[PDB]
Amino acid sequence: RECISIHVGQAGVQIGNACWELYCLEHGIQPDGQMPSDKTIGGGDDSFNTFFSETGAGKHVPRAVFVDLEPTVIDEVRTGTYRQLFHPEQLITGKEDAANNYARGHYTIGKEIIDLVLDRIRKLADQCTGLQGFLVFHSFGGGTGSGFTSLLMERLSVDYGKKSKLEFSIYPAPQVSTAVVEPYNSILTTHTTLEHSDCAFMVDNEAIYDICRRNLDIERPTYTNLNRLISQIVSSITASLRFDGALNVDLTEFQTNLVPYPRIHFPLATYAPVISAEKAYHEQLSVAEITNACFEPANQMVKCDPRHGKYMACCLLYRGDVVPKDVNAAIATIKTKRSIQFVDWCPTGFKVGINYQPPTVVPGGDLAKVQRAVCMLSNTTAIAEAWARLDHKFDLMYAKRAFVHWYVGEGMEEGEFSEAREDMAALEKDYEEVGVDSV
Amino acid sequence: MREIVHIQAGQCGNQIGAKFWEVISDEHGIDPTGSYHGDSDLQLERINVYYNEATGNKYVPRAILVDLEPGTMDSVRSGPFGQIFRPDNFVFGQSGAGNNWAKGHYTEGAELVDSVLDVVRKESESCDCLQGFQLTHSLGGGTGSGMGTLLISKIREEYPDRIMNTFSVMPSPKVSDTVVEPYNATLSVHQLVENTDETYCIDNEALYDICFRTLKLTTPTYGDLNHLVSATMSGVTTCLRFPGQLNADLRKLAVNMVPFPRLHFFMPGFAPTVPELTQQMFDSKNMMAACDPRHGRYLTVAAIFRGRMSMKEVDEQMLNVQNKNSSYFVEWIPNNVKTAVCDIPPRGLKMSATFIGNSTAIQELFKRISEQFTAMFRRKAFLHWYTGEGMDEMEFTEAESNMNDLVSEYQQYQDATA
Ligand SMILES: COc1cc(OC)c(Cl)c(-n2c(-c3ccccc3)cc(=O)c(C)c2-c2ccc(F)cc2)c1
Ligand SMILES: Nc1nc2c(ncn2[C@@H]2O[C@H](COP(=O)(O)OP(=O)(O)OP(=O)(O)O)[C@@H](O)[C@H]2O)c(=O)[nH]1
Numbered sequence: 001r002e003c004i005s006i007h008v009g010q011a012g013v014q015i016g017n018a019c020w021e022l023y024c025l026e027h028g029i030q031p032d033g034q035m036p037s038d039k040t041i042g043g044g045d046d047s048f049n050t051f052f053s054e055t056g057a058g059k060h061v062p063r064a065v066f067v068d069l070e071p072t073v074i075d076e077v078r079t080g081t082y083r084q085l086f087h088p089e090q091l092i093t094g095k096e097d098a099a100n101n102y103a104r105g106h107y108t109i110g111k112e113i114i115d116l117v118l119d120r121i122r123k124l125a126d127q128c129t130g131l132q133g134f135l136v137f138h139s140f141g142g143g144t145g146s147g148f149t150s151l152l153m154e155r156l157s158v159d160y161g162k163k164s165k166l167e168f169s170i171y172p173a174p175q176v177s178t179a180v181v182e183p184y185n186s187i188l189t190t191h192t193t194l195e196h197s198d199c200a201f202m203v204d205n206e207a208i209y210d211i212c213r214r215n216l217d218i219e220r221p222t223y224t225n226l227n228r229l230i231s232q233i234v235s236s237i238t239a240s241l242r243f244d245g246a247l248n249v250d251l252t253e254f255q256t257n258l259v260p261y262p263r264i265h266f267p268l269a270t271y272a273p274v275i276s277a278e279k280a281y282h283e284q285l286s287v288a289e290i291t292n293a294c295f296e297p298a299n300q301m302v303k304c305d306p307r308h309g310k311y312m313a314c315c316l317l318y319r320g321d322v323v324p325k326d327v328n329a330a331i332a333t334i335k336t337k338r339s340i341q342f343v344d345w346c347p348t349g350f351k352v353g354i355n356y357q358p359p360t361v362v363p364g365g366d367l368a369k370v371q372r373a374v375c376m377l378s379n380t381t382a383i384a385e386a387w388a389r390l391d392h393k394f395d396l397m398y399a400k401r402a403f404v405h406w407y408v409g410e411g412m413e414e415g416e417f418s419e420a421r422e423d424m425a426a427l428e429k430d431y432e433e434v435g436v437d438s439v
Numbered sequence: 440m441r442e443i444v445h446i447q448a449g450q451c452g453n454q455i456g457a458k459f460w461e462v463i464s465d466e467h468g469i470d471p472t473g474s475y476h477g478d479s480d481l482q483l484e485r486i487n488v489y490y491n492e493a494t495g496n497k498y499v500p501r502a503i504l505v506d507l508e509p510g511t512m513d514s515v516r517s518g519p520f521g522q523i524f525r526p527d528n529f530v531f532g533q534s535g536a537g538n539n540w541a542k543g544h545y546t547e548g549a550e551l552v553d554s555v556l557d558v559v560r561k562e563s564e565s566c567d568c569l570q571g572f573q574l575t576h577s578l579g580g581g582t583g584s585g586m587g588t589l590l591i592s593k594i595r596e597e598y599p600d601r602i603m604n605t606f607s608v609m610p611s612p613k614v615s616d617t618v619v620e621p622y623n624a625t626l627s628v629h630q631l632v633e634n635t636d637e638t639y640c641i642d643n644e645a646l647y648d649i650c651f652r653t654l655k656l657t658t659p660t661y662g663d664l665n666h667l668v669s670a671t672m673s674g675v676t677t678c679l680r681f682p683g684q685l686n687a688d689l690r691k692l693a694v695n696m697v698p699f700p701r702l703h704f705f706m707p708g709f710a711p712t713v714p715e716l717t718q719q720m721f722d723s724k725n726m727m728a729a730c731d732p733r734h735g736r737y738l739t740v741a742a743i744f745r746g747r748m749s750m751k752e753v754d755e756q757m758l759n760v761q762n763k764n765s766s767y768f769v770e771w772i773p774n775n776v777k778t779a780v781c782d783i784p785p786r787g788l789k790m791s792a793t794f795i796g797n798s799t800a801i802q803e804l805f806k807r808i809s810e811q812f813t814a815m816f817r818r819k820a821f822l823h824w825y826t827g828e829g830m831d832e833m834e835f836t837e838a839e840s841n842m843n844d845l846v847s848e849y850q851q852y853q854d855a856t857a
């Protein structure tokens with residue numbers, strides 16, 4: 001029961017760098033891949049083996065692939081503290097990036113390297129007794145993150161069919177955006193990928209940026225700060241696959257309980273508690289307190305107001321000092337609050353899980369080591385607010401065909417821009433249809 | 440001599456089944472290694488009903504363990520009595536069912552079902568006179584829910600003249616942990632209505648309130664709830680495992696409990712003087728299913744008392760409750776309450792009372808499920824997960840109709856007069 005992570009572009013690679021660093025600390029894997037606590041050498045059916053393969057020498061190798069169309073970012077990995085952890089074939093780099101151009105990442109530069117990426121992925125898959133699916137980390141805005149990811153997703157649908165594909169996407173934010181055409185790249189990748197991904201977790205950089213300032217007193221956050229925080233959400237989601245437990249979810253479970261309709265598969269994550277060490281000092285937070293924090297809009301990962309929408313499904317993943325009795329009471333209270341509205345076609349609307357391994361913080365980080373934490377994955381109609389903001393920015397530029405020549409110069413037709421935008425128009429409509437009360 | 444075959448499917452079924460074998464192994468004096476170290480000899484007169492006897496006078500449960508994921512399978516073998524089970528009777532997959540009834544019934548469970556029947560067949564051929572099957576499972580998941588009812592359908596095709604019992608955990612009115620449980624439960628109930636002779640309805644919310652309110656367990660766990668179920672499962676099988684004449688085999692029990700074939704869903708109960716025991720077992724607060732017996736009428740009832748007690752006092756106290764609450768017993772099935780007594784008490788208790796009731800109030804549970812199910816199906820919410828495994832929408836419509844029919848039937852007899 002195994003998962004392969006694919007990290008694409010600067011954002012995906014740099015996010016993976018934080019996630020795999022956290023995985024090693026959670027499992028006690030050293031930067032050279034050795035895990036002393038593991039006594040089954042060269043193999044095993046342990047829970048952590050879903051994400052780590054093993055060699056006869058006792059090394060624990062991530063079941064991951066790093067791909068970028070320029071080597072600047074992945075070279076850090078090849079020389080960083082965790083360079084020994086990855087086999088050289090796992091890290092794949094071109095020589096010329098996509099220049100914030102979806103078309104270059106999909107057609108011009110992407111096709112140069114797609115076949116090699118699939119071959120290295122296939123070698124990882126052949127090392128599997130049973131493969132659940134793929135975890136794809138990328139950014140909506142970059143040329144490689146959008147253009148190449150869409151090509152990879154389409155190719156994966158062919159080589160592996162209906163096998164699960166889950167995305168971790170980075171929604172553009174002007175605070176740190178390095179491209180004016182990011183709206184074009186996001187609408188195009190979303191449309192191209194929309195029918196290939198079974199579930200996509202979006203993260204709005206602006207939301208993370210505000211959370212880091214407010215909750216962690218970080219006066220001017222950097223990608224390092226943001227990426228560690230994303231890692232906690234990714235760690236919590238994968239915790240049920242990497243750690244052995246009786247109250248876990250797996251890819252198939254929480255997919256089946258979060259996605260009511262194929263196109264409506266964009267939940268927004270919420271994590272709690274996000275606290276600095278100063279405030280954590282002499283302050284321990286209860287299961288109910290962190291459970292209530294998940295429904296406060298301030299702690300969301302996409303700028304939106306769930307109060308102005310309706311919940312269709314909530315997945316609450318607790319980890320740490322959490323007892324079933326506390327969890328049941330917390331969710332019981334939520335079901336009494338009327339500020340939290342569920343659609344009328346979802347009476348049972350809570351998937352629940354508990355893992356007993358406590359959260360881990362990387363040394364030198366800003367998050368405090370807490371005893372219990374919770375991640376909530378909620379599919380609410382409020383997420384459509386995010387699509388509306390990005391579609392409006394798409395419209396403003398496309399009305400004047402601004403920047404479109406860069407895409408036509410790389411082979412695309414104006415039809416793909418309207419075709420993609422009409423798909424987003426339908427999706428915006430689908431999100432209001434599902435929010436209407438039944439007859 | 441009249442042997443029963445036990446099957447446990449899914450994470451829920453296996454956990455409950457494992458503690459069932461812990462309780463009755465202790466009651467029959469079997470230790471984890473499979474050797475008898477007991478005091479009385481009534482422990483062995485009917486041991487062959489649930490245990491095979493193997494070389495060396497070691498007793499091995501006639502149990503088959505099933506699940507589409509290996510996790511809970513490994514916990515069973517590491518448990519207290521995990522050593523006792525026949526290792527060839529562990530039949531497990533690797534994928535899991537993902538709370539998908541279609542996966543357990545049609546795709547992922549289909550690939551594993553024949554491997555299960557091969558163990559079933561091998562056990563049944565080793566029976567002097569096979570009696571029937573009993574299954575433990577939940578209706579909210581995908582393995583015990585979906586694959587469980589597949590095994591039931593397959594087993595009937597090979598053993599159509601044998602009794603089929605089930606211990607089924609039903610969805611609860613207010614506590615749930617899976618979003619699609621209305622779909623999985625409604626699809627299983629459709630199966631059980633057609634392919635089971637007796638079904639015991641258990642819901643966890645009732646068990647949890649007992650654990651929290653009555654036994655005063657401040658932080659109950661599935662561990663604490665399962666101890667209640669295993670105690671009850673021991674009580675309902677006492678007449679099958681110890682010498683007696685009343686409801687001494689599965690068919691005789693079914694013939695005394697099931698006046699109409701589709702209305703075979705029972706409300707179990709357990710308790711905890713003789714007058715005190717009899718009052719408790721009838722109380723709503725001692726029922727394991729979330730249905731008030733005072734919201735319906737009892738078609739039939741079976742009470743089992745265990746331990747040393749004055750049968751005169753018991754017989755007199757059972758009659759008072761019947762004559763005290765005549766309104767809650769159908770007038771057109773005379774003498775529909777049957778009482779049995781066994782001298783062997785459970786461990787920790789000296790006197791126990793187990794209650795089995797076929798009450799029309801059970802329709803409330805089937806209405807709760809139907810209401811939830813329709814709310815989802817009218818909008819086809821979460822349906823793509825099922826049609827994606829090959830199902831058609833009309834399989835859902837039929838399952839809904841059958842349960843709505845089952846609810847109508849229960850009401851029909853709740854208002855019948857003489
Ligand atoms: C049925 O759906 C459930 C929902 C739920 O939270 C809303 C909980 Cl906590 C439980 N649950 C769990 C558990 C299950 C899945 C994930 C994590 C924990 C473990 C456990 O030992 C006990 C006793 C219970 C339980 C059962 C019936 C109750 F009335 C109250 C609590 C079950
Ligand atoms: N959270 C987070 N976002 C990032 C990071 N790096 C880039 N981004 C975002 O990604 C978008 C730009 O895409 P990039 O990842 O930089 O570009 P790329 O994927 O390498 O593709 P090319 O531009 O063709 O090289 C912007 O919206 C940035 O805000 C990161 O390390 N962390």
Ligand SMILES: Nc1nc2c(ncn2[C@@H]2O[C@H](COP(=O)(O)OP(=O)(O)O)[C@@H](O)[C@H]2O)c(=O)[nH]1
Pocket residue numbers: 448449450451452454455536537538577579580581582583584608610615616617643661662664665
């Ligand atoms: N009593 C009890 N019920 C359980 C347990 N685990 C799960 N359940 C019930 O079963 C449902 C989850 O289904 P599950 O057992 O995982 O189904 P599976 O997919 O077939 O294994 C929940 O609604 C619970 O009420 C357990 O250990 N004890």
Ligand SMILES: [Ca+2]
Pocket residue numbers: 038039040041042043044045046054
């Ligand atoms: Ca190992």
Ligand SMILES: [Ca+2]
Pocket residue numbers: 038039040041042043054057058059
């Ligand atoms: Ca090793």
Ligand SMILES: [Ca+2]
Pocket residue numbers: 550
């Ligand atoms: Ca298969």
Ligand SMILES: [Ca+2]
Pocket residue numbers: 553
């Ligand atoms: Ca065969």
Ligand SMILES: [Mg+2]
Pocket residue numbers: 009010068070097142144
């Ligand atoms: Mg780049």
Ligand SMILES: [Mg+2]
Pocket residue numbers: 246247248249
């Ligand atoms: Mg589970």
